[PDB]
Structure formats: C-alpha cells, structure tokens
Amino acid sequence: PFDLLLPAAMAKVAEEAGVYKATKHPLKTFYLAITAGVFISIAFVFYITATTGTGTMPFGMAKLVGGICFSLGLILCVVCGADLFTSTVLIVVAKASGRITWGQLAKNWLNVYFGNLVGALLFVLLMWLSGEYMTANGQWGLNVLQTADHKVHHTFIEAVCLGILANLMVCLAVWMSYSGRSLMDKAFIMVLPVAMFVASGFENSIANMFMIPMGIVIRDFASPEFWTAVGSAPENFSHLTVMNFITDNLIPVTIGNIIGGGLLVGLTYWVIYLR
Amino acid sequence: PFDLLLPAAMAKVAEEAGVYKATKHPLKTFYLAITAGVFISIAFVFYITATTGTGTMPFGMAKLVGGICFSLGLILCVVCGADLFTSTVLIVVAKASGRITWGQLAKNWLNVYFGNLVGALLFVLLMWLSGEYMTANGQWGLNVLQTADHKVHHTFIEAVCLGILANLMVCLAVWMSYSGRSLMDKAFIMVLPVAMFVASGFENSIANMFMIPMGIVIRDFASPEFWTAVGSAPENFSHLTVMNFITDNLIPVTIGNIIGGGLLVGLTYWVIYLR
Amino acid sequence: PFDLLLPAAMAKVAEEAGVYKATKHPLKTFYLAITAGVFISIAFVFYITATTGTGTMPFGMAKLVGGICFSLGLILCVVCGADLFTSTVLIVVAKASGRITWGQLAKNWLNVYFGNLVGALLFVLLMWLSGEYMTANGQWGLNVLQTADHKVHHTFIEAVCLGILANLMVCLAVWMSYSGRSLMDKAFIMVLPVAMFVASGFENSIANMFMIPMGIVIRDFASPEFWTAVGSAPENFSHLTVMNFITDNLIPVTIGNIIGGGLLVGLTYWVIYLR
Amino acid sequence: PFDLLLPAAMAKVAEEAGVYKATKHPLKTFYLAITAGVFISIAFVFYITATTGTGTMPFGMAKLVGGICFSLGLILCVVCGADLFTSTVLIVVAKASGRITWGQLAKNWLNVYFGNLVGALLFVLLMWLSGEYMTANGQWGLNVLQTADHKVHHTFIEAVCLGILANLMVCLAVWMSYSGRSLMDKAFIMVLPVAMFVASGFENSIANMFMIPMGIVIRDFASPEFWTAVGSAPENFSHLTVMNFITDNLIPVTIGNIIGGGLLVGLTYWVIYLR
Amino acid sequence: PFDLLLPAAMAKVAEEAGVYKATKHPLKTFYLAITAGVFISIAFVFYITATTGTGTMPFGMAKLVGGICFSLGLILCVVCGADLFTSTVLIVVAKASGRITWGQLAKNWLNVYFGNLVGALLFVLLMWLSGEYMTANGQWGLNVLQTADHKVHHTFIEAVCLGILANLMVCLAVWMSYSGRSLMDKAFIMVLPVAMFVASGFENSIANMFMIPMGIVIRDFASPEFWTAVGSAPENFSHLTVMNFITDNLIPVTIGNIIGGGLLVGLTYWVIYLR
C-alpha cells in the first residue's frame, strides 16, 4: 500500500502480464498492436520535429531533447495498454515459468509484429497526406531522409548489437515501470531509459518500421520544389530501398531486439528471482 | 486505491464521462464551452508569447517550448471541467454504447462548437483591447500574423489530415488523463501529447478560431507605427479573410477533428474494450 | 480519498475559503496581507534577477523563465496562507452565495490592499538597503528602471484590460490549486498560469506596488557611479512619479483586477455550479 | 490523511520540531551540525561547478541554474535531519511558546554554529586535497576566488540586509516544507526559494563559512601554474584575509541571519497563529 | 502511512537492507552485481553521448546535463535491486550493529566488486561491437578517449580524495532514497546528488571500470579513418594502459570509495542514531 513494488513483486507482475498478454484474443492483440505502431510512429514524428534544424546545436543536447520527445510513444504504449513487440518479447518470462507454451509465444510475437507494421504504415500514409515533409522549407523532410539513410548503412553484427542495446533499454524501462503504482511513477521512470537509446542511436525495429518507409516515400514522391529547397537530389539517397530496408536493417535489428529483450532482461531476472 | 486505472476502467470512465457530458443542461454546456474557448485562447496567447523572437533559435526547440506552453489550455480544460469540442467528440463512445442518442450527440456538439467560438471571439476582443500586438516592437503582432497566414494556405486533404493528427493527440491526452487519479497525473501526462501537435503544426479547429480572427483583426486595425516597426504592409497578408478562414481551414480542419477524435481514439477503444 | 476534487467540490471549497477569509480577525488579515506583499515582492525580485542581462536572449524564452521564477511568490501565498488581494477578490463567490455581507467584503478588500501595500514598501526598503541595484554593474537596477518605466506608459483601457487578463490567470491558478490535495498538486498546477501573465506582460496591482516604487527609489537615490555604468541619466526616466504611478497604473490595473478575478472566474463558476 | 498541512498545523509542527531540536543531546547536535556544514559545502561546490565558465552566458540564467544546483544542500539538510544554523534559528517559535528556555536556545545555537564551522572546514580540507581548483584550466579556482572576493566587499548595513534576505528565503523554504508529507513535497517546494537567494546574491553565514576559507586557501597555496593559467596573481585578491572574513562578513551576515529567520518568519507566524 | 521516513527509521531500514544484502546467496549476488555493472556502463554511455560536442558549451552546464543523464544508472540500480559496490559499502552499518560478521562483509564486497567488473567488461564488448565510437564523425570516441585519459593522470592522494567525494554523494543519495516511499521519491531525490559528483569530476571505481577499459579498447583497435577524422594518433594516448589503469586509478579510487561511503555516511549515521 502506497509503496513501490520490490523486485520480486516486479518479476511476479511481469510474469502475470506476460501470461495475460499471451492468452488475449488474437483480434484484440492485432488491434492493440496497430495502436502501438501508431504510438511509436507518433514518437518518431515528435523526435524528427524536435531535432529539425539542430545542426548548429551540440550533438548530445539535441539528441537528448529528441529522446525526451520520443519517450512519449512508449509512455503511451504502457498507459494505453497497447501491444508493442519490444514489450511482448518479455513474455519469455512466462514461457520460462511454464504458464504459456511455445505456440502461444510464437503466435503472439507474429501477431504483434504484423500489427505494429500495419500501424506504422497507416501512420506513414497519414503523415504523407498531411504534407509535413515541407516543414521549415523542407528541413523536416531532409531530417527524415538523413535519419532513414543513416540506418541502412550498418553491418550485420553492428545492427544486431544496436538492436540488443535498444531493446535492453526498452525492456528495462518496462521492468522499472512495473514497480510504479500511479500514472506518474509509470511515466517519469521511463523518460531517461528511452532517451538514452534514442540519443545514442540504438536501433528499434518498430521505430524503423515507421522511419525507413517514410524516407522511401519521401525519396520517391517528393516534389521538385522540396529538392530545390533542400539542395539535394533523389540519387543522393539511392540506397533507400525496401529490399535494403528489410535485409540490412529489419532482420538483424529484430534479432538483436529479441536477444536483448528476452535474454538480457526477462530471462536474467527470471533466473535471479522466479527460478 | 492509490493505483492508476487499467485500460478497461479507463474506457468505462470515458463512457461515463460521455454520458454525463451529453446529458448536461444546454445552458451550462454553453457556459462551459465559453470557458473552454477562453482557455484555448489563453494557451495560444502563451504559445505566441513564448515563440516570439525565436527566429534564430532552432526550429524544433522553439516549437517544443511553444507546445509546452500551449499545453496549459487543455490542462485548464480538463481540470476546470470545461467543454472543449476536441474533447466532446469522444462522446461517440457513449453513442456507440447506446447510452445516448444521435440527437443528444448533435445538440452537444453544436452547443460546444458555438460556445467555443464565442469564447474565442471574446478573448480576441480582450487581447485587442489590451494592446498586446505591439509587444517587442511589433514582433508579437508579426508572429500572430505569420501564424495566421500560414494556416490559410493548406489544401483540403492536407487540412483534413492535419486536423485528424491534431485531434488524435488531443483525444489521446484526454484518454491518458482518464487513468490519472490526482491533479498531477492528470496534468503531466498531458504536456507531451499536446506539445507534439503544437510543435509539429497540426491544426486544431478551436485553436484556429482564436488564431485566425486575431490575425484578421491585427491585419485590419493595426496602427501604421506597427507596420513601420515590423517592416511590412497589410497587402502582404491579403489572404487573411473571414471567408477564406471558414472555407480553407474551418470546415476541413473540423471534419478532420471529428474523424481523428471519434474514430481513431473513441471508436477503436470502444471496439477493443467496450464491445 | 487520494483523488483530485471535481469542479463542483472545487467551487464549494472556494466558497468555504471565501467565508473563512471574510470572517477572519482584521489584525490577522492585516498581518497575512503584509506577508503576501512580501512574498509578491520576493517573486518580482526573482523575476528581475532571472531576466537580467537577457537582451540577447530571445524575448519569449527569457520572459518564460522570468515567469517560472515569478510563480514562487504566489506559490508561497497559497502554501503559507497569506492574504493576497488578487486572491481575496474571489470572496465574491461567498458574497453571491449570501454567506457574507457587502460590508465584510469591503472591509476585507481594503485591509488586504493596505497590508499588501505595506509589505511591498517594507520589501522595497529592504531591497534598497541591501544594495542590489548595483548587481551586474548596474544591469539589475537598469532592468528594474526599464520594467517600471514601461508600466507607466499605458492607456486607461489598455491598463484595465491588462489587469483583467492578469487577475484572470491568477484566479484561474488559485481555482485549479483548489483541486489539488498535496503540496505538489497545489504548486505545479500554478507555475504555468502565472508564467503566462508574467511573460505576456499583464499587469498585477500588487506586483506593481513593489515594482514601480522600487523604480522611483532607484531613479531618485542612485549613485552617480550606477548611472555612469548603465550609461543613462535620471532624466531618461522622468515619468517615474508617484502621482503617475497611482493615476496611470494603480487605479486602472486594480479595477481590471476586480473585473477579471471576481467576475470572469468567481461569478461565472458560481453561476455554473453554485447557483 | 493524504492532504497537505494547513498553516496552523504547519506552525504547530514547527513548534514541535523546535522543542525536539532544542532538547536533543549536545553531542548528537554537534555531529548533526557537522553533517549540515558538509552538506552546505557540497551545495556550494555544486554551485561553483555549475557556474564555471558561464561568463558569456546571461547573468540571470547562469545564477538561476547555480541556485537550482545549490538547493541540493538544504534538501539534504532537511531530509537527513541535519542541524543547520539557518534552520535552528526557527527554535525562537518554541522559545516564544515557552516550551524551551533561553539557555537551551543559546546552547543549541552555539553548538550548531560551531559544528557547521567544523564541517565546512573539513570539507574545505577535502576539496583542497582533491585538487579541484585546477578544473577547466583553473577556471574553477578562479570562480571560487572571485566569489570569495566579492563577498568581502560589503558594508555593514548591506551585509546585514543581505543576510536578512537570505535567511528569509531559507526559513520560508523550511516552513513550506513543513507542509509536505512525502520526500517529494519536501524537496520540490524548496528548490525555488533557495534558488532565489543564491541567484540574487544574498549572503548565508554557513555557506560563507565554506566559501571564504576556500578562497583564502586557494589564494595562499595555489601553484604558479594555476596563476599562469588564470592570468592573475595573488596580490589581486589581497583582501581575502581571515580577519576580514570574520569582521566584514561573518558578524554582520550572521546578525542579519538571526534577524531574518527568527523575527520575520518564526516570530511573525507565532504571532499570527500560535499566540 | 503516506509519510516520508524519519532519519531514525531511515537508519533502521539501511541496517535491515545491509543484513539482507549480506545474507543473500553468493550466485544471486554475483548476478545482481553483473546487472549493476551493466547499469553503470549504461549511465556512462548516456553521459558520453550527452556531453559529446559540448566544447563550445559552457563547462558547468554541459557537465550538469551529463550528470543528470548519468543518474539513470544508479536509479536503475536502486529500482531493480542490483548490487553496486558503492552501495554495498553501506553494509558497514549492519557490521557495526553486529548483525553480520566480518567474513560476510568481505565475501559480499569481493563478490559485488567482481560482478561489477564482469558486467562492465561485458558492456564494453557490446559497445565496441556496436560501433558507437564513430558517432558524430568520431567525436564520441574522442570524448571517450579524453575522459579515459584525464582519469589516469591523478596523484594517489588526489585519487583517494576524489573517490571519497564520489562515494559520499552516492551513499548520500542512497540514504536519502531510503526515505522515499514510491518510485518517484526514490528517483528524483537521487538525480542531484549523482549529478554533483559527475559534473564535478569525482571518480567512481565502478564507473571507471567501464570508462578506462573502453578507452583502452578504442585506443588499440580503432580504425585509421577514426584517427583521421578526430585529427589525432594513438601515441597521443600512450598512458592508457591496463597496468596504469589498475595502479594509478583503481586501487586509490576504490580505497577512497570505502573511506567515503562506509565511514562518512554509514558509520557516522550509525553513531548518531543506531548506537
């Protein structure tokens, strides 16, 4: 009563949440994953808006403010009960406890991944129809294009490790929020961990599902006035391809996400406490 | 007790609030809508004051600070119980639940819209009688004029999508505040979502009801000293017309507001939880 | 229990506080008004200290930081139970409810006004005896002089409307703090509304009771070294006169304060809820 | 329960705390005063570290950040139960109530003053042995020397009034923290009042007990490399003398501290409420 | 209930936590120490990311932001129940109380130290495999190298005193967090004390266990493109050697850590309260 949960109780509520999320109806899970993807896309839009025009600003300060803005998406995911893949990886605790089977875990992960992708694509369509890429004389679109272009230029091991580091922070934020008992203890304990992985540049698969397709759409369908304003051409971002997106980024970053989240946070604390 | 509300309880308190707001007396609803319009105009005044003179400042940082300042209006609307149209669209949850009829919804929406417009006009009159447009050697009035001029230059589909995105954030902030149990959990969970839509540039109909008429009034009745100080002439803002305001902005942004708020937040969560 | 007060309960605690404040002993009211004036003078000293040297800083950011600093005075007034005139105007709710008479209201308002003036003068004497006007090579005194000089150059209608807007924000902050149940919900819900009216430039009579006499004292009794450092002369601020202070500022700003506070916040919510 | 304390209860808990602190064992009081002096020295070290290199930064912003950093010391003093002289002056409430005698008050004040001085000297020794004065190519030591040099150049009446203003803010912060019921309401209500007196330049005797001896030690025992880096010589700070420290600063600032704290905060509220 | 713990209760919960941590199973202690080292490495990564490119920024502001970012690691250690050596030194309270023996204390300290080192090395390997040292055209790696190089250039007495000061702040933050009763009172009371020791430059042994080996790895295995971008050569950091790391830094900083933490915080408060 009125007290923060101790780590053992944190692990037991994590186990219970894993069982609850794994036993939910597939259609409800799909809808919640769509909302989670929409929230993550909202967070990346805030990040891009905040970090626009900060070239003269110091690198660390601008990235820190961008991460503080980006934490809104995962705060929304936690508060609104949406199913985010980075958070659904933590059902490995319930899997190890034996309360859920491997088939339930596989179905939940697939459903949440697909729903997150659908939500990210829907928000990409909305963002493009809004005309946001011409903000600040095209600097918003240029920021989107540069952010997307940088993510497609990583090695397999580098992408895997970046995904491990990103899902480490996301699952640590979720685990810490498990201790909170109010809307504020479950939101303010989650700004710094997310801001770390956003400012550092760690790669999140769900966030990339919004980022890279947005960059591809802007590279393809931008008006010539946008290119004239930004002083660049589409051939400067030729590497922004769907196949390159899925191959150079999606698979390695996703594999790193599983390895980080449900091996370095879920399983380790299950071993420490719930074994 | 002492715990944040779970999403199912959040949806049920949203339904109950919708029924309560739809069954209120029309005169009380009109007065509360007037207060809500006054609060929204207060928020836009804070935004304009904060963002004045930030041309040299980075775009994202200045817009983020402006949004943080702007969140005060919706915080006031939630705390003081005022009826804001962006929030009254969420009575579609109670409509879908069957607790209220279509006539009640239509009457509530019309009354709240009219009251918000009346409150915005009253605060426009107060702001003009205050002489605030000559602050910082006319940079306050110039900021108001530029903000109003930019909003009148959007396509129908772009305005509709911008309104969808704005009401998405507003209704998401309201839905998240439904989880809080104190004045602080119902205020700090609402700064970031509002700051997102303010910094990004998403269009809110109620906020525009204060913004654009203020710009028209300043364009019409400004002293020649103000124009000399700002180095511009009224013909530079010829497009700032009442008919252009209602046609290019009000109808599309309002339609986008309904489509965002009571289709992408209210109905989706009613389907997920209250069906 | 553990929950924020609903607007009806907020209005009833406002009514009860009005009755309690109107029925207090006159000497206790005088002492509390003196403490309130001291707190308001403390807030203006923080504002001046924070905004010193921010000429190169953007206008909005500097004024926002100054308002955040200024909110300390009204936070102190609320927490410590001091009687501030901007807050005592809200006893019009209890007057309309019939719990107090017109004579009690008049006596309370006069006593609180006189006590606030006495406290502001005492803090002016303390500030002058401290030697603070020579801070930053006289930039503190120059900031005080410019702030005082700008306030004496407003029309009657402009001053009345500025006072209306200022007391609107002050009474709205008090009304919102009525909802809070802890020291933090009653302090953080009060920073933004005060910061708005401070950054915008709205005129508060009690704050001006410290500001303008301080400027007059500095204009009169400053050392020639201060004038040499600031590169100005007393004849540059000839308009800073006590008669000009009371006539151009005190009466119109005070009348606007009553019209804002106990007509646009107190009476409107009494009509909505307590009628 | 769950509610902030009303001013009458705040005064009664202040009286009870005064009796408790006055009736404590002298050795425990001495140890707690040593810890309080260490905490105050920690706060001044944070202030110096934060304000180092901020010459190009605006005066008010840099001093505000320095005060926010400095509030940590008094937050530590309140949370950890240390006996700080600025806080022990408030036992005048219990003295006026008759619960403690004059001898107890005198012994408590002397013991706390001596313990604070001993703790400040111990932290001065630790800071010198750490080698911190060579941080940022000697700018840390130069900041310490300038801060110490400015404090030794005040008139008796100016020093007395500055001490009155400083202890006013410190005792007001303590009195406001008496209302809080958790670690957060007793810490966040204390940042702004302390930041005011730090940013403004009001003189605290305990803080000066760390500041000035540190400056004397740096002036005496600095390496010639430090002087070469800072581009100055010890003769530029000849006035930094122990006798000048105790005569020009310690006695007047301390007398102002008593007059502020236990006449303008303690006795006034005892008269208002506890008489 | 709902109230912050008084200092006597703070000391008794510190004693109980010491007994609990000293009586835990060695393998669980090792795993928790590994997680604590990972969290500390995460905090140093945030610090490096935040402070990258802030050469033009004022020294104090940049170091303050870096410390605010760095506080995340110790917040994670407290919330997640990890065993950090700087925190395990406080079991000297339980040792003095007689509840645990000297052998238990020695075994706990050795196990926690070894686990922290293993976790720091694992995160060093992950950081190197991520490729983070090429961020901002090698400015991230240059910041890491400079931070590591500066720490290897301290005298024995200076390193001992810096460790004393660092563990003072860490143990004071832990002791203050013992008073909090929620996730927020146990996190926000811990940002300022950690930020102090990070901004000032006080040396923490566990943090150095991540910092210096990372610098050695970057100095050894960096690509020539990184050196070309940063405009430097490995011979500029020849002193970055493992033997120099353990001799010039590890032993003196660790000894200072024990002397600070479990003599100046644990034993002093045991003497004041628990004797």
Residue numbers in the entry:
A (entry chain A), B (entry chain A), C (entry chain A), D (entry chain A), E (entry chain A): 6 to 280
Authors' account:
FocA belongs to the widespread, evolutionarily ancient formate-nitrite transporter (FNT) family of pentameric anion channels and translocates formic acid bidirectionally. Here, we show the high-resolution structure of native E. coli FocA, together with the H209N variant, and describe the dynamic pore features that couple to the protonation state.
A FocA-H209N variant that exhibits an efflux-only channel-like function in vivo reveals a density consistent with formate located directly at N209, abolishing the channel’s amphiphilicity. The resolved structure of FocA-H209N at 2.97 Å (FSC = 0.143) exhibits minor structural differences compared with the native structure, but the polarity distribution across the pore is disturbed due to N209. Capture of a potential translocation intermediate for FocA validates the disturbance of the polarity distribution across the pore, while in vivo experiments show that an E. coli strain with a mutation in codon 209 of the genomic copy of the focA gene, and which synthesizes FocA-H209N, has impaired growth due to reduced intracellular ATP levels, correlating with massive formic acid efflux. Immunological analysis of plasmid-encoded FocA-H209N revealed that it is as stable as the native FocA protein15 and PflB is also stably produced in strain DH4200 (synthesizing FocA-H209N). These findings demonstrate that the amino acid exchange in FocA-H209N does not affect either synthesis or stability of the protein and has no indirect negative effect on FocA’s interaction partner, PflB. Cumulative analysis of all protomer channel contacts over all simulations performed showed that interactions around the EM density are highly prevalent. This indicates that this location is important for translocation, promoting the possibility that the captured density corresponds to the substrate.
